[PDB]
């Protein structure tokens, strides 16, 4: 699905050695710029074992 392809791309981003130690907020804004919704961003963080609440994601994007 188009959604699953966005989430797959996001997971690979979040796993990268240069990305992983950087702050959550910068990762979230980057992923929104690539077309992800807040809910897709939330799914991607959980898929890399770094779960974030939707509340936190939405507050960053607000």
The binder of ligand 6RD chosen from 1, 2, 3, 16 (CB under 6 A): 16
| Interaction of residue 6 with ligand 6RD, rule CB under 6 A | yes
Tell me which of 3, 4, 22, 46 binds ligand 6RD, using CB under 6 A. 22
23-30, Cβ contacts within 8 angstroms, sequence gap of 24 or more: 24/52, 24/56, 24/60, 25/60, 28/57, 28/60, 28/61, 29/60, 29/61
Contact positions toward ligand 6RD, by CB under 6 A? 6, 9-10, 12-13, 16, 18-19, 22, 30-31, 34-35
């Amino acid at each position: 699905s188009e959604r699953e392809k966005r989430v797959s791309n996001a997971v690979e981003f979040l796993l990268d050695s240069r990305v992983r130690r950087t702050p959550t907020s910068s990762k979230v804004h980057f992923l929104k710029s690539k077309g992800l919704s807040a809910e897709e961003i939330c799914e991607a963080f959980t898929k890399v074992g770094q779960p974030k609440t939707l509340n936190e994601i939405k507050r960053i994007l607000s």
